[PDB]
Structures are given as C-alpha cells and as structure tokens.
Amino acid sequence: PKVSVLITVTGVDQPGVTATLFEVLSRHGVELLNVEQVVIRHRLTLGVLVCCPADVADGPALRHDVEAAIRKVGLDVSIERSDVPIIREPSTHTIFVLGRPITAAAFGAVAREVAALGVNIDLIRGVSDYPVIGLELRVSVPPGADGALRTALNRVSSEEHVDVAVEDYTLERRAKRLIVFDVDSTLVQGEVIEMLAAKAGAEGQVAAITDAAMRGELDFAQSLQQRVATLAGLPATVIDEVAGQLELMPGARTTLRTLRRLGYACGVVSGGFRRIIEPLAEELMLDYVAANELEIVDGTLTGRVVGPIIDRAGKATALREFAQRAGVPMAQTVAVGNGANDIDMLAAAGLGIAFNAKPALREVADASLSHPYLDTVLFLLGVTRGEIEAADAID
C-alpha cells in the first residue's frame, strides 16, 4: 500500500459500526496505521488512518463503499488523502480539579488560564463523583511555561474554591511507588499531643502552641519541648489510653488499602510519639515508622523527649532513609502532610501534597487538598473512584 488515507466517522453511536467499517475497508487493499475511537454521551468518533494502493485511493470505489455503508445506518463519514501525524504525542502534564462543588465559573477559569499560556488540552475526563467531584485534564504545556501555569492555577484555585493540581505526566515521574503520611491531622484526626495534654488539664496551652508551630510561627523543636513539658508527671498509662481514642481521617483505610493494591511502600513520619504510633502502624501494616520518643522514669512521663528529635529537617531525612531502604528514587516518592514542620519533607518528595494545610505548607506544596477526605490523595495519584469501587467489589 503506497498511499495514506484518513477516514473519519462521527454521529450517534450504534452497535456494529466498528466491525462494519473495517469489513468494508478489507475489500480495498487497506492496512492500518492508527485507529482512535471513543463514545461520549452516545456520540461516536472513529478516526482511521490507513495505507492503501495508489490505484484504490485514486478511484471512487473506496469512497462509495465507505460512504454508502456508513451513511446507510445513519452516521457521517469523511474520507481524505493524508500523506499527517500517525500517532499523537503523549501529554506533558495532567491537571486535577476537585471540588464540592465545581462551578462552571471555576472550571471556566481553569480553561482560560490554560489557554492564556498556550497550553493545549488533549483530554478531559471525570475521575470521581464521590466524595468530591473530580475532573482530569491531560495537557501539553509549552516548554518552560509550566511554572507560570502552576502559579495561574493556584490563583484560580484560591479564588474559585476548588483544588487544582498540575503534575508531570511522563513515564518515570508517574510511576510513584512510595508514600509517607504525617500522622496528626493528616492520617489521624486531630493532634495527639493535645489529647495527651487534656489528661494533664493543659489542652488549652498546648493547642495554642501546636497551632502556632503548625503555621510555622515557632521553631518545631522548642515548641515540642514546651508542649511535652506540659505532660510532666502523667503516668505512662496515658499513652495507651490516647492510642485507643485515635480516629483515622475519613478515607484513610481506603487510601492505604488502594495504595497496597498498587504496590506502594507505605510509611509514616511524625514529630509525635512512637509508643502511640507504632501500635497503629502495625494495625495498618505500614512498612516504615519514624517518630519521637517520650522519656519515662518509674512509669511516669518526665515531660521530655529522648533525642534525637525528628524536626522539620528530620522528616525529610526520614523520607530519604525510607526511600533508600526501599530502593525507590526520590522522584517516585510521595509525601502528605498538613503542617509547617512538613515543609522540608514535602519539598524532598517527588510529589508533595498538602492536606487541609496551614498556609505555610500549602504555599510550597506541589498540590493542595482542601476537603476532609484523605482518599482524594488517590485521585492525585491517577486512580479513579470507579477503579477503587471495582477493586473493592472484587475484594
């Protein structure tokens, strides 16, 4: 076959259209170069790029056979000489838009910012209807423009009340294989240290300092010392008590379970306390835990921690350690956190996700999530709600 022909079928979807076209094409010397077919809301598009004999293409028979067969059953067809890209290039990036709701104005603002920077939209699809509306756009970004893109979509995100994430869509960068979660107000509801403090009747003081520290207004280590000192004199039994009171973030189990299906190494990195966390890590079958450790004398807390202290730099160090042991390059790691002491860890990771985060963190994170559902992380990792439900139904 010495000449290229492009055949494009559109119209209202009907069964048997696909088979019919290639059966027709088989009466002409047709060999296939590319086929693309989708149906959206009962609208068929079928594009077929072929090679056929010059003799066949320069004759009305191929045309008449195709036009007759397709028009008969009620669709439209176009036929033209090509001689035209065979296969489209991969998208460079993907954009996730999550919201509850996603207004038309929000999405319209995303599409406008995209167009402004010369970014072509290659595909749009929904990735979730629950617990949040989620939409994916795969895009092609002009080289060097993707900084400008992230800045623009960040402005759009704050103004229009949706989450917007722009991620690299290349082969390696999207083979993410390792994830770490902060514990307090990320994997687990609330702040453990405040739960401990309440037992000393110091919930007020400690909560104040915690929120100061999580906004980046206080050095993490000094804030840890001031807060843990509050616990001086509590019996160590308080540790088990609080451990048994802990509630997982909504969507946490689904998140971990789905990540296990995908072969992720999973771990936690916390400035909190190991005796409280390790019990839970075991229950969640995690692969790695880094945390601080309470000092205990004669079955009583002293109000100090045992060095060395996992601080902001310590969390990045822990992630790096974990990924080295697991044999996972940093570019294929994910970190999820909510607070300013997570800043270094999020920056070290391939993908840093700020989850219901203080401004300090959301300001430097690759992506931010604002809804109280930890499983929206999965959407950022290329999973759809449909795929989660299917896998869970298969059990």
Footprint (CB under 5 A) of Mg ion, residues 184-213: 184-185
- Dihedrals phi, psi of 100, to nearest 5 degrees: -155, 70
Which among 55, 83, 168, 184 is annotated as catalytic?
A: 184
Give me the catalytic one of 163, 182, 342, 366.
182
Is the preceding peptide bond at 308 cis, omega within 30 degrees of 0?
A: yes
Instruction: Give the binding-site size for Mg ion (rule: CB under 5 A).
Output: 5
- Can you tell me whether residue 230 is helix, strand or coil? coil
Q: Binding to Mg ion by residue 344, rule CB under 5 A?
A: no
Give the integer Cα–Cα distance in Å for 252 and 248: 6
**Which whole-number Å values give the CA distances from 121 to 5, 91, 320, 349, 394, in the listed order?**
26, 9, 35, 27, 34
Q: Which does 71 bind (CB under 5 to 8 A by kind): Mg ion, a second copy, none?
A: none
Nearer to Mg ion, 184 or 344 (CB): 184
Residue 184 appears among annotated catalytic residues = yes
Answer yes or no: 146 catalytic: no
Residue 338 interacting partner from Mg ion, a second copy, none (CB closer than 5 to 8 Å by kind): Mg ion
Closer of 127 and 357 to Mg ion (Cβ)? 357
Footprint (CB under 5 A) of Mg ion, residues 354-373: none
- Which residue's CB is nearer to Mg ion, number 136 or number 194? 194
Q: Stretches 181-189, 205-213, 346-354, 372-380: which one binds Mg ion (CB under 5 A)? A: 181-189
What is the smallest separation between the CB atom of 307 and a second copy, expressed in angstroms? 32
Cα separation, 34 vs 50, whole angstroms? 7
Report which residue's Cβ sits closest to Mg ion. Answer: 184
Do 251 and 229 touch, CB atoms closer than 8 A?
no
Closest distance to a second copy from the beta carbon of 341 (Å): 29
Amino acid occupying residue 233: G
Task: Tell me whether residue 157 or residue 258 sits nearer to a second copy (CB atom).
Answer: 258
* Residue 184 contact partner, candidates a second copy, Mg ion, none, CB within 5 to 8 A by sort of partner: Mg ion
Q: Report the residue number, 54 or 123, with the smaller CB distance to a second copy.
A: 123
Query: Which residues, 6 or more positions from 28, have their beta carbon under 8 angstroms from its beta carbon?
Result: 52, 53, 56, 61, 62, 65
Q: Is the separation of the CB atoms in 157 and 163 below 8 Å?
A: yes
Do residues 186 and 368 lie in contact, with contact meaning Cβ atoms separated by under 8 Å?
no
User: Beta 31-40 vs 163-168: how paired, if at all?
Assistant: unpaired
